[PDB]
Amino acid sequence: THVQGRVYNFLERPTGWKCFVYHFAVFLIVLVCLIFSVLSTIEQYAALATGTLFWMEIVLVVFFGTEYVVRLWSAGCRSKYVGLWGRLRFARKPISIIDLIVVVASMVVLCVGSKATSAIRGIRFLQILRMLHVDRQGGTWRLLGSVVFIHRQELITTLYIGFLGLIFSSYFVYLAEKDAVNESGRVEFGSYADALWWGVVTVTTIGYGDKVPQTWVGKTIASCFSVFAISFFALPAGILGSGFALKVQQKQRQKHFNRQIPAAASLIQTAWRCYAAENPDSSTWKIYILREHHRATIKVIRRMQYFVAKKKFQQARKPYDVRDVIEQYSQGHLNLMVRIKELQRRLDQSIG
């Protein structure tokens, strides 16, 4: 039972300095395969590529097929993937779909191309997808999707504004110069589509230099538009950057992992209690020591306790904030005032 867990932590959850090297080696192998896919197009180094890349594709199909058949077992180690339908639920994960696709399709193409043809025409693209075969847990995509999902409103606003400005400025430009001939004998803004091409080239601060306005009106429009709008299509870079920076700033204000054990234990306890009460023949009633008109009050106290425990738990996972202090002080001052009141009552009892 240890073999499976070890191999799974080796293939799926990489940690240490004896598996990072293996993954880096696999990645470098994929990179070499890509590079040899590149040279297949060079007219000079053609005949060598079509053979070396073919043999590399063979060996890589073997390697990845074996690794996948294995990872369909290590993943069988876990408990949510156990069983036949379990492993089926593992091959449903996106990355597994991708891996199966790539492996089987490479096999098919290769065995169909045995006898520079459509074989390579397709392998040139198959060898590209394997670049996704490096990140297993998919932390990168998760992080990016989350940070984008938090800032959806601002990005929508920015893109809308930029696209609107692009449309309007491009049409105005096209209107200002649809007949002014280039320095050479070639009218440039013959259409509106070419104008939109120029606009998308400009607004992103690329400037290929193929389309440049001629009439001074067009130059004025271009100057104003470049001054105004480029600070929009290049803005999302600042939003996501600052978002990543702030979210990293959070990661240094996380509570000690030990500081959330009691909350979780209490949550589990109360959640079980709220279920064992539905069975009146249970033994949980032994905590209060037959009783007929007292069942409902207990049944509701259990629910209140479950809700407050869930709140205290979901609060013990977020970082330190001002709500923590502004609630803790109130709680402590409440306790202290209650103590003073009790002492006052006892002293008035004694004197009186």
Binding site: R78, A264, W272, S283, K286, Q331, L334, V338
Partner: protein
């Protein structure tokens, strides 16, 4: 649901012995100690201030009904309770040691007793040392 509303009204009447249209921390502490629980003066407020959505500090009948009617069997509750197991899991393989479970359940937080724990385990899948799949727990306790 008529019968449901009337039963919750009977419950509210049993809670509020005082003649009024609300519930305060005093009445709740009274009904609590009536059973022999000996609570503090802060957990009572923690109970109360999480049931009323008006910041009023007291519970009205509509807020009490909103709470009691809140279906606590959903995907959010199931996810939270499932997440609160993985703190007690080494290797995250979804398997807890029966002995480790007994200890962490009897000794921490709101302390259970021998009978309750011995009942909770006997109603689950116990193969051997470990192999206590808490997925079975989260599914048996989140099936309404």
């Amino acid at each position: 649901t008529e019968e449901q509303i009337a039963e919750f009204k009977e419950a509210f009447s049993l809670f509020d012995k005082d003649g009024d249209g609300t519930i305060t921390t005093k009445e709740l502490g009274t009904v609590m100690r009536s059973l022999g629980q000996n609570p503090t003066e802060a957990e009572l407020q923690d109970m109360i201030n999480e049931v009323d959505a008006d910041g009023n500090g007291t519970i009205d009948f509509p807020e009490f009904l909103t709470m009691m009617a809140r279906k606590m069997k959903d995907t959010d509750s199931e996810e939270e309770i499932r997440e609160a197991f993985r703190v007690f899991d080494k290797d995250g393989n979804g398997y807890i040691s029966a002995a480790e479970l007994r200890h962490v359940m009897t000794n921490l937080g709101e302390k259970l007793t021998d009978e309750e724990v011995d009942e909770m385990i006997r109603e689950a899948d116990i193969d051997g040392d470990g192999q206590v799949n808490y997925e079975e727990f989260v599914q048996m306790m989140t099936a309404k």
